[PDB]
Design a protein around this ligand. Structure first.
Ligand SMILES: Nc1ncnc2c1ncn2[C@@H]1O[C@H](CSCC[C@H](N)C(=O)O)[C@@H](O)[C@H]1O
Lengths: 265, 265
């Protein structure tokens, strides 16, 4: 009679919360999507094995067009679950699915999980200092998205950090890397020239958060653009003016150039 | 030789991730702190029972002044776990502890869990639209802090949502309610008079995030400043201009007045 939105976490199946595991385990039907993000440490099997249920994986289409046709009806007479990577409501449109559940007479519940949005705290950057967020999207045809560039600008003026979610094309199995993102940013700089993103801008890269050996790096674009951060998923962060402790961490932990320690108050 | 920072999640003892509960059980020693926050939906006893390890609670002084004399020494020759509410390293000072671990030649790994920063997505407000964050502190003595007001000013000005943490006297186990926070904001408005927070201002209140039955309420200050949002802690959110999808979710899910569909979009 109820629908459960359950996050699976950052990297592998275990990143699910105890609450989530016990709820899934006792659900009649189990659905899930793997297009809003990439969990690089698991497979559908492990998930099924860990949960003890078969999972019917839905596509973006199935969801954005037929959620209320494929999943809701079932919830009407059973306890159904819908699994997603990270937290199910962060940087997605799944929140709107809840309204569909309401309009279908189905009560829904959200079981949170660790999200990349807060996991970036491992970069040593103060979470409260992050400003507006944005996504570096793959250009399509002659359409070249640029707004994410303005966000960085607007935040930096206020001294706020910018969190840049990198694009993903699950079906095409395309996962944007920090490098490609840095590449697109540089090209946007040329056609705007706002002195916002250049070879001397400081950036921070976080790859595969949730894994025990994630890639945490900070430095100048020039020195990082061609660097290997390992397999996806990747996220890019353009920090604002740093606090001494943030810099001390970036250097001591992310291998940033000791010269960022000498902050220009 | 290994120090494990494990997040306990948001509300009860079931909010810890499966990876966290396993790494915790296999540790030799287990520390925890409940000064940055409390798990209002559980107890130290229930967490101890779930992990099967006695837990030593450290104070804000035990950590900020003697982390290296209390926890790291044991981490040199054993597997030690440091448990904290929410997601590790989100609390602005916990990051430098990893630096202390590095300095002591100790290995450290961060085991994530749900944070209030990502969990607030249950309000239906888009995550990327959150700006700088802040804490509403109680005035006291001759000290009357008001920055959180300006934070709201700069975010709403750029159409960004402001996440407001409410003061907590962790030790005395005393919380600031959402109602109290509003009353304080009105007084700040009444003094600075910047057209930021008034009776007509729209706010969102989140309580007990992480439990299956969170309180999600949205509406105008004048109709919510005296409303009963249940037990603490409470999170207050002052939204910026809303996306129609956001407003609809606040109406359909958080019981907000239809008036917001024409006044706040
Ligand atoms: N474990 C991880 N490590 C690094 N980046 C990650 C990540 N998980 C997600 N991301 C980033 O966020 C994008 C997916 S956005 C969807 C996020 C999800 N709801 C959550 O709560 O995490 C990815 O393309 C990537 O840029």
């Amino acid at each position: 009679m109820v629908l459960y939105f359950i996050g699976l976490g950052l990297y592998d199946e275990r990143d699910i919360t105890v609450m989530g595991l016990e709820i899934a385990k006792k659900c009649d039907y189990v659905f899930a999507e793997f297009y809003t993000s990439l969990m690089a440490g698991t497979t559908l099997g492990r998930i099924q094995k860990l949960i003890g249920k078969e999972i019917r994986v839905l596509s973006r289409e199935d969801v954005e067009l037929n959620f209320e046709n494929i999943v809701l009806p079932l919830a009407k007479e059973n306890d159904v679950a819908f699994l997603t990577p990270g937290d199910p409501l962060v940087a997605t449109t799944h929140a709107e699915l809840r309204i569909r559940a309401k309009r279908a007479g189905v009560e829904s519940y959200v079981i949170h999980a660790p999200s990349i949005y807060s996991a970036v705290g491992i970069t040593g950057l103060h979470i409260y200092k992050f400003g507006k967020s944005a996504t570096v999207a793959y250009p399509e045809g002659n359409w070249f998205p640029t707004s994410y560039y303005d966000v960085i600008k607007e935040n930096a003026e206020r001294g706020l950090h910018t969190l840049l979610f990198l694009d993903i094309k699950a079906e095409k199995r395309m996962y944007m890397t920090a490098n490609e993102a840095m590449e697109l940013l540089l090209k946007v700089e040329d056609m705007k020239k706002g002195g916002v993103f250049t070879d001397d801008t400081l950036v921070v890269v976080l790859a595969r958060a949730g894994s025990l050996n994630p890639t945490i790096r900070a430095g100048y674009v020039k020195d990082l653009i061609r660097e290997d951060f390992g397999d996806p998923p990747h996220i890019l962060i353009v920090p604002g003016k740093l606090h001494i402790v943030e810099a001390e961490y970036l250097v001591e932990i992310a291998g940033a150039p000791r010269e960022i320690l000498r902050v220009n108050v």
